[PDB]
Amino acid sequence: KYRVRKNVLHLTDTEKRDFVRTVLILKEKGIYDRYIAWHGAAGKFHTPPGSDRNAAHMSSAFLPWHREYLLRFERDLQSINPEVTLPYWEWETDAQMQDPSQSQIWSADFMGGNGNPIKDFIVDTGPFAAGRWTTIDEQGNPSGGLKRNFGATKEAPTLPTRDDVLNALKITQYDTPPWDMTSQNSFRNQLEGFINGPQLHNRVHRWVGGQMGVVPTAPNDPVFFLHHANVDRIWAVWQIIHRNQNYQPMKNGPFGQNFRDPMYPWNTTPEDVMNHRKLGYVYDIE
């Protein structure tokens, strides 16, 4: 209830600089790669095998899984610099922009810009440009560096809007059977973005393109964590009015998705991360 995750647009120049340095050092230390790997590994743990659910997506644990993911990432940041928290990318505000690629998250100070169409959409500006930041592929081996291609596909030309978020916050059920990408009247599936898809979460990945555009490589882009901080904040808001609306399935869902099941690759259950205050952080505007 103490560490403050701020809007990226509210970070000072110094905070932007100190976040970048901390990420770059986590990368240098070999710790960043753990997060890419953890996320890829969860995508091949299906609940159960034969289904299209997995531990981290496409089912109920999507939200607690990434909250734990971000919680551990932030602790790793804090061990380098105890004054650094994970900011969030309020994309729904950027979607108001005439050209959201002009948002300050994309400044050379911070995330760097869209990919260069002349250079196969390689990101060539910012602290994660090719040459300053290595990437790995899905199989875990070295890759070609950061790629981005904002709004390039016809199904996600734009970012999710504020209205897309307000509509999601109105869903009263955390999730609904069969706890997958076809769940109706489900906050989890609304936010993940499978109704009228791709929307919300799914639509951000599709919008950003590059490595963020294919899930198993998405954390190669630091903006991945800023994106998921915003998703986690939006879940946190849902938990203030739908406070107590808790989690489903409580039981008798696939193993790995129930309230007290471990979320692969960890032992943490959804229950363990239900209250973000007890996890030690708050969002600003909370």
Added chain:
Amino acid sequence: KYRVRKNVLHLTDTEKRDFVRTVLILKEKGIYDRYIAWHGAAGKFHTPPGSDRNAAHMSSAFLPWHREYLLRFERDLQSINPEVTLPYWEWETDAQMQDPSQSQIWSADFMGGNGNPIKDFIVDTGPFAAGRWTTIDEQGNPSGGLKRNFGATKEAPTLPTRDDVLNALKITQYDTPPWDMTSQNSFRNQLEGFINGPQLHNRVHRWVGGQMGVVPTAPNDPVFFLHHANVDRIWAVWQIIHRNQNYQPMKNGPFGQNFRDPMYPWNTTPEDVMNHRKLGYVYDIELE
């Protein structure tokens, strides 16, 4: 020192029954799959990226990684049945048999037998036969049954011998630079089995064949854990014999291979698991 991990050949009938029943329970609950996935996942964490070293193999952390792995597994067995401990498959004495494939470990009441060549080497005897036990491919998807093909490759017609075990135990260095498959005079690399390989650990995988013959799918076979408990036992024995040798590298290995580095996919470090008695178990041979 409390939990005693016994030779499979010394297990009573009820012990074998209880071990099997407990593993079937872990499988039915969905917990067993976590150990399949962890093992595949660690192979994809290269230390550093682009090296063939990974979190669980091909470098110094091979031994502690699997000690932690079995420890977690055994603890999951104990949640179900606190009287069940992880036995070890002492393959070096099976190697002494006229026909090692007749070891009691492959009895229908324990691991079940060799694959059916009519059925493309699907195991159809024992508690893990097809129709009683489902398997996953490297992607996490169903793959249609446990396979085994004992001694079928030219590189590994036989299991490792007692002499191979004893000869590894003479190595005084736990590991050596460059902490990879070329490491010479290295207990870790010798036991893992890359010196004129496959030997020892690498050889057991190739000898069992089936899923065990390919490392990312090996844990689909429950004998994987009895194999690794034997690898753990040999290391524990090395640690008794060479009491003033400690883990290597102590620093300046690749991240994930040093004494105090976390072992992906966990936060556990080699230091955390260096003393197997501190982990709450002993092998029967230490007690005799």
